[PDB]
């Protein structure tokens, strides 16, 4: 509970994925730190702030069918920090669609999250 | 070329791996910005300019034996970055193993790796495949 180790990070970011998948909102922003961003796609202003992250996550998992599955390991630092590959399966246009992502966080003293990056594009969304 | 859109970083990205497949080290080190910056593994001070990244490369490729290869799509952005996923195959002690890592891509507006970061550890090297 300090700064995770790379196991750990191992542990928190496959944590992070599950609950997405189960959709416990509430149960990913307790992941974030007070001053943590999110930045999702990258490219687009960090978000901040806990009622903004909260209606981040609520905006994109609320409708409760959503799945979130990691497609390779977690590759883990020793400072903290960590990127993953994974999948997700949504509704887009009406129809399911998949998504390709990949997340990079860095984890604070506190074994909280500060940033989180996700990476993609429509060069990865892939309608089913 | 100029910044690069996002399916152009997906192709850049993805010659970053075969130029690494075959090991042209010069080949590599011109696909990066006179003055970019290594981080690999990320955490460890980050490798600065040309000269530095080709000794970089060279003390992990020019042995032989490494071969890398994608195991997912590019994750492009439309601010000329991506990311990957990919295994490097080497052989250590004469033992095969193998290292799974995440690169992460800012590219300039002449389309060279402006910064790279990799993302592995320890956690990440499997001495049975
Ligand atoms: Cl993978
Ligand atoms: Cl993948
Ligand atoms: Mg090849
Ligand atoms: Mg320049």
Redesign the interface.
Known sequence: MNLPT??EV?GLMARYIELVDVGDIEAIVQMFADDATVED???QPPIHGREQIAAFFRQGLGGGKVRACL???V?????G?????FRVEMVWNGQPCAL???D?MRFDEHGRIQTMQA??????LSVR
């Open positions: 790379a196991q191992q796609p990258f490219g497609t390779g390991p590759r883990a630092s020793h400072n920090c960590g990127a993953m590959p390709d992502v990949i990079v990476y993609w594009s429509e060069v990865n």
